[PDB]
Amino acid sequence: ASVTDGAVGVTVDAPVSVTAADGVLAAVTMVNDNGRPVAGRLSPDGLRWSTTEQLGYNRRYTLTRQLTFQTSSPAHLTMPYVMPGDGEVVGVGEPVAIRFDENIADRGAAEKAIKITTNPPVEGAFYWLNNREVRWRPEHFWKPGTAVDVAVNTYGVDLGEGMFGEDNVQTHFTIGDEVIATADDNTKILTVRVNGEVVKSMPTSMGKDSTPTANGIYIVGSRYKHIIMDSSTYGVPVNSPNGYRTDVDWATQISYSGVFVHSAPWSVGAQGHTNTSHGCLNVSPSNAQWFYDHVKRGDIVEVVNTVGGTLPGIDGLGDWNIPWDQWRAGNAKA
Ligand SMILES: [Ca+2]
């Protein structure tokens, strides 16, 4: 008796179950609304029947007892979008990210509606970057070869203030080799390591003392063969002292705040010696092209020993700078 006859606002995120005791079944069915299309092909085993098919918004359904009831009529719907993409191979730093097209009032319900399955299994937890986007990651970087399945079962879920999930989404992806590039201001060398071994060293020029490159762990985001770096997009006006408008080749993004690894033919002499940029990691055109071709989304850039502070944990690509105890405690709830 999972629903009462006459009931309204019956939620469609849960199945509709019936149960005996002491007894046996049946003879159980449900119909129909639309439409009249019939039930969820039943189920085993001895003492209980459940829906298979998932129910629509704003329907009557008919279900010894007979039960007629009506499902939720949401005031607002929000669509989730999940990254990374289906079938993608990403680096060891890639969090699962679920972005909604609305601000979510009930973060707890949204987290409960998301099911993440890892093989091999590893513990992880959710943390919100803003009102729209939540991330999930383990305590340490992913083990290479790990397979991940993400089921965002937001359809029928009440997400607070009359807002419901518009659909369910899913992704399955894989973790590739461990790729970690360290930019060390002591040597002005960017070293790329694959599973712990050096495969490439590149002289770099990082942010100058007044606009330094923040230290910390950065996640590789998108890459661009050519792009116009415009400071205004990162809050700083082009005609101001630290402003700029610069055509750049082979640009790999590592922070939403605007740090890239990219081709910097103008600072080749300074690379390895002097920091000249506004925060970017300048390298040679061929080292940048190499980076662009070989480093993938979710790979790691670690910057150490600069005169800067630390990249913010909520940059967008700075997730790994939040200590685990804090990340794990979360910010869905007190
Ligand atoms: Ca909507």
Curated annotation (Swiss-Prot):
State whether keyword Cell inner membrane applies: no
The annotated active site, in chain numbering, is H262, C280
What more does the record tell us? Answer: The peptidoglycan structure of stationary-phase M.tuberculosis is atypical since it contains a majority (80%) of 3->3 cross-links synthesized by L,D-transpeptidases that predominate over the 4->3 cross-links formed by the D,D-transpeptidase activity of classical penicillin-binding proteins. In fact, 3-3 cross-linkages predominate throughout all growth phases and the ratio of 4-3/3-3 linkages does not vary significantly under any growth condition.
Instruction: Provide the topology term for how it sits in the membrane.
Output: Lipid-anchor
Tell me the function of this protein. Answer: Generates 3->3 cross-links in peptidoglycan, catalyzing the cleavage of the mDap(3)-D-Ala(4) bond of a tetrapeptide donor stem and the formation of a bond between the carbonyl of mDap(3) of the donor stem and the side chain of mDap(3) of the acceptor stem. Is specific for donor substrates containing a stem tetrapeptide since it cannot use pentapeptide stems.
**Pathway, per Swiss-Prot/TrEMBL?**
Cell wall biogenesis; peptidoglycan biosynthesis
Question: Where is the protein found, in the record's own terms?
Answer: Cell membrane
EC main class here is transferase
Molecular function terms in GO for this entry? acyltransferase activity; metal ion binding; peptidoglycan L,D-transpeptidase activity
Q: Which gene is transcribed and translated to give this protein?
A: ldtB
Please identify the protein, giving its name as recorded. Answer: L,D-transpeptidase 2
Q: Where is this site: Binds to carbapenem drug (covalent)?
A: C280
Keyword annotations for this protein, in alphabetical order, are: Acyltransferase, Calcium, Cell membrane, Cell shape, Cell wall biogenesis/degradation, Lipoprotein, Membrane, Metal-binding, Palmitate, Peptidoglycan synthesis, Signal, Transferase
Predominant location of this chain?
membrane
